[PDB]
Amino acid sequence: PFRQDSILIIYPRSQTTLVQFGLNEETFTVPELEIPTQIYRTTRQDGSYTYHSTNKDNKAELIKPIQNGEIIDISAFTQFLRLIFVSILSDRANKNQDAFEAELSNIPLLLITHHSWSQSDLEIITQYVFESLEINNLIQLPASLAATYSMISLQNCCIIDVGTHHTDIIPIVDYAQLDHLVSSIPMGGQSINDSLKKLLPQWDDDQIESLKKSPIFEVLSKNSDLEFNTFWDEKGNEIKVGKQRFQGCNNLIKNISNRVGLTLDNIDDINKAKAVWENIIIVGGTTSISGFKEALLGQLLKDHLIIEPEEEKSKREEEAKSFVPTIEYVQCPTVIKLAKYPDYFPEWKKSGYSEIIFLGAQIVSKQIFTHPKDTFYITREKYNMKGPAALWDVQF
Amino acid sequence: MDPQTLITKANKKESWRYDWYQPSKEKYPFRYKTWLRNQEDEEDILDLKEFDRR
Amino acid sequence: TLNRKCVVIHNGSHRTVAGFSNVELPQCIIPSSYIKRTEAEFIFGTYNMIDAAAEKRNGDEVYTLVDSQGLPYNWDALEMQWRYLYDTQLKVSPEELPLVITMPATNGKPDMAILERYYELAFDKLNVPVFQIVIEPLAIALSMGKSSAFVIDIGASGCNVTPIIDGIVVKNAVVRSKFGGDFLDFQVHERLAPLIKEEQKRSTDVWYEASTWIQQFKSTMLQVSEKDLFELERYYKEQADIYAKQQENNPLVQKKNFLFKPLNKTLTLDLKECYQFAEYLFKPQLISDKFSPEDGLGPLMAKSVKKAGASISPEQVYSLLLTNVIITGSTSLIEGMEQRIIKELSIRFPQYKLTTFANQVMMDRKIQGWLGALTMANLPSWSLGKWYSKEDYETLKRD
Amino acid sequence: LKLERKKTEAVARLKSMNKSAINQYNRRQDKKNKRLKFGHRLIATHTNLERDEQKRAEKKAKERLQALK
Structure with missing residues (x-):
């Protein structure tokens, strides 16, 4: 144990699910498999359910198991995992045919979880992985920790994970996710869309979405020099736009910031707190919008930095006209910083770090699965003894 | 091949249920759900490549 | 150890702590109070309330669940809170798992009446399988x-x-x-009042301020002096005179700076004024002439x-x-x-x-307190604690 | 008799609770340590990944800068 060919990482999210089977060994590659997170559920007279990849003869209903990051249908969710897992087996079993003795003989699974999943959901998933998929080794890695492990392993930090309809804020102290501080706001990328609809009434949804995803949309805090600029439709249609391309991100940025502030203010050990504020981690699709992260930082500074009020400072400098020492405050944060990205994953640098949580998982899985110690995953041994409850003896 | 048999041929053994349990000292008056071990007696495929990015 | 997982709930007079017995920290720490916003409606949770509080909307009012005895006194509201905990935080039917909750030490009197209200809540209403009550x-x-x-x-x-x-x-x-934490909130507020402009029904702002700047101030400004402060002062003075007289630094003159956010304004206290707040806990005769x-x-x-x-x-x-x-x-x-x-x-x-x-x-x-209940819930034998079952309730119900 | 009983019973209740309490506390500390230890190792793993990349990139640039195309 274990073959690197064999490591399987799954990262399921509301819209899609990133998947990878086998680690490259030279450098880590950005996940190439992206499967939409949904399954079809046919209902068979007599009550029971059947699950397929396609609307079978238009008889099945379309189930989207994960919504706003939460599992809303645990049965369709487990069926969706099986569907992924089986597909991978078939694919490899064709290509190579001796696969069941090699690449498919011992498949350890790392499943990236979301803060919102029940213990009940996590146990059921564990049961499913050991009983239905007949897999033997499982790590359930929280998304937040994947984040901090990718980010050159930070003991103290805050994860701001911007989704489409919600943003999660998750403080990490001493490599532990602080559950009672964790929260999400019902606000994300779509907010930008919505802000823009108000500013550009005569546009439609696809036009607005296209602007957001275009080279000329940025958050300010040379394109910025031009009054108007140009970009091209999804359907090739050229669209011109004024100052609106520097708008629409503000309401979201303010909401996130207000939340970050209330959160970090409830970290009880001020020495931990100082560290967290100095390692803000921002992740998610939205964050790839040029200027966004820096704009968000800018706002956290504007709202939360402990520093002398400018008027007060200006008086003191007039007074000294007749050198001014710095006023020291008892509060934190006096320093706010974004955590430093690792620049030595070439493939990741190339594609941006909106999905860096996955790199977290590539690193953890290699660590854990290419070393003897079985301290951080459930094994068959353990499953046989405690069952799904085995899960809680290997939490991080 | 049959998905179920693919699952069966890879990765090579108990089963648990989540059910009512009534502890004893004989038996306490109360119940509670837990993961109990069971006694002796107790669809499709998708094509990657569509989902591969290109 | 035992094949079980308990829900552990601690209702303090100020904070409520909840989580499962199988992990080292609680899933949630939320306020033991709620906003009643008005068709009535009940807001629970730290961020939900701080958001609603900042909205500054009329008719919004904060009420409490735990009296100064450390005992629940509003049982209809307590159920709503428990529902909230089980539904949105632990996310589990209250009917599945054993429950462990706390009571404060008493002289013995209010005990039976409380135990009954708990039966009614745990059994009649929630359908909890069985619960233990530990003494904090x-x-x-x-x-x-x-x-x-x-x-x-x-x-x-x-x-x-x-x-x-x-x-x-x-x-x-x-x-x-x-005299404790809440008392300190009152004094920090009354004392700082003139520097921040400021100088039930107005519960919402009192609460929001207590939960925001006042909480930070306590954690960063207050200190407790090691020795009776009035004595420390006389001494430091008596010493200071000699350093002065001798040639031709009193520690209480050190200044401390707090950035007050709502007005972007610095508040400076000398160390004495910082020591002063907690002195009241020790010598409460220093606020009123009505305290011995x-x-x-x-x-x-x-x-x-x-x-x-x-x-x-x-x-x-x-x-x-x-x-x-x-x-x-x-x-x-x-x-x-x-x-x-x-x-x-x-x-x-x-x-x-x-x-x-x-x-x-x-x-x-x-x-x-919650940590304590947690270590009770992880005790290796069912015989280590009194566990009330639906039975116990039935039998008490007889005459 | 019914006393020698009750007493030893009581003494053992306390003795065993104290035992569980001490064991639980040591388990906290252990989890906390194994956690901090895993974190602090990944930092080292990162450092090695970084050194390896640097060597790789250096060998690449070195050939690139002294050869066409």
């Missing part, structure tokens, strides 16, 4: 490897002093001070030990208690507090050697 000072002490201890809990409602001898709680020596020095924490601790010596030698109980002093509670984390509680105890009992114990980890004392 007792569990905290056990969680700390101690069977006998003098447990000094400084929370929001005041100080709660509880001698515990060989696993048993001495009820007649149970003592609850009236005996309502102060020092006399109170002493009173409770002496009432322990009356069991049912004294200079033995005295010796037991004083070699197992436990200092606990959110407010006990204010810098200088342990040392003053110790100095205050040591001088009322000079013949004896005091040894005190305290969780030094910031988080863990704030929730040490």
Whole structure:
């Protein structure tokens, strides 16, 4: 144990699910498999359910198991995992045919979880992985920790994970996710869309979405020099736009910031707190919008930095006209910083770090699965003894 | 091949249920759900490549 | 160990802590209060309330769940809170798992009436399978490897002093001070009032301020002086005169700076004014002429030990208690507090050697009550605690 | 008799609770340590990944800068 060919990482999210089977060994590659997170559920007279990849003869209903990051249908969710897992087996079993003795003989699974999943959901998933998929080794890695492990392993930090309809804020102290501080706001990328609809009434949804995803949309805090600029439709249609391309991100940025502030203010050990504020981690699709992260930082500074009020400072400098020492405050944060990205994953640098949580998982899985110690995953041994409850003896 | 048999041929053994349990000292008056071990007696495929990015 | 997983709930008078027995920290710490927003409607949770509070909307009002006894007094609201916890935080039917909850040490009287209201809530309403009630000072002490201890809990409602001898709680020596965290909030506010402009029904703003800047101020400005402050002052003065006179630095003149956010304004206190707030906990005769020095924490601790010596030698109980002093509670984390509680105890009992114990980890004392209940829930035998079942209720219901 | 019983019973209740409490506390500390230890190792793993990349990139640039195309 274990073959690197064999490591399987799954990262399921509301819209899609990133998947990878086998680690490259030279450098880590950005996940190439992206499967939409949904399954079809046919209902068979007599009550029971059947699950397929396609609307079978238009008889099945379309189930989207994960919504706003939460599992809303645990049965369709487990069926969706099986569907992924089986597909991978078939694919490899064709290509190579001796696969069941090699690449498919011992498949350890790392499943990236979301803060919102029940213990009940996590146990059921564990049961499913050991009983239905007949897999033997499982790590359930929280998304937040994947984040901090990718980010050159930070003991103290805050994860701001911007989704489409919600943003999660998750403080990490001493490599532990602080559950009672964790929260999400019902606000994300779509907010930008919505802000823009108000500013550009005569546009439609696809036009607005296209602007957001275009080279000329940025958050300010040379394109910025031009009054108007140009970009091209999804359907090739050229669209011109004024100052609106520097708008629409503000309401979201303010909401996130207000939340970050209330959160970090409830970290009880001020020495931990100082560290967290100095390692803000921002992740998610939205964050790839040029200027966004820096704009968000800018706002956290504007709202939360402990520093002398400018008027007060200006008086003191007039007074000294007749050198001014710095006023020291008892509060934190006096320093706010974004955590430093690792620049030595070439493939990741190339594609941006909106999905860096996955790199977290590539690193953890290699660590854990290419070393003897079985301290951080459930094994068959353990499953046989405690069952799904085995899960809680290997939490991080 | 049959998905179920693919699952069966890879990765090579108990089963648990989540059910009512009534502890004893004989038996306490109360119940509670837990993961109990069971006694002796107790669809499709998708094509990657569509989902591969290109 | 046992094949079970419990829900552990602690309803303090200020904070409520909830989570499962299988992990080291609680899933949630939320306020033991709620907003009633008006068709009525009930808001629970730290961010939900702070958001709603900042909205500053009429008709919004904050109400509490736990009286100053540390006991629930609004049981319709308590159910809504429990529902909220089980639905949105633990996310599990209350019917599945055993429940472990806390009560504060009492003199014994309110006990039966409470137990009944809990039956009604746990059974009639929620359908909980079975529950245990642990006594907070007792569990905290056990969680700390101690069977006998003098447990000094400084929370929001005041100080709660509880001698515990060989696993048993001495009820007649149970003592609850009236001055603690919430009191400190009032004083910080009244004193800073003129620098921040400011100088029930207006509960919403009182609450929001207590939960925001006032909380930060307490954690960063206040300190407890090691020795009676009036004496410290006379001394520091008497010394300062000599340094001055001698040639031809008084520590109380150090300044401390707090950025007050709502007005982007610096508030500066000298160290004396920082020491002053907690002095009230020790010498409450310094606010009103209506408080005797005996309502102060020092006399109170002493009173409770002496009432322990009356069991049912004294200079033995005295010796037991004083070699197992436990200092606990959110407010006990204010810098200088342990040392003053110790100095205050040591001088009322000079013949004896005091040894005190305290969780030094910031988080863990704030929730040490919940931590205590947690370590009860992980006890290896069902026989270690009284576990009330639906039965017990049935049988009490008879005549 | 019914006393010698009750007493030893009581003494053992306390003795065993104290035991569980001490064991639980040591388990906290252990989990906390194994956690901090895993974190602090990944930092080292990162450092090695970084050194390896640097060597790789350096060998690449070195050939690139002294050869066409």
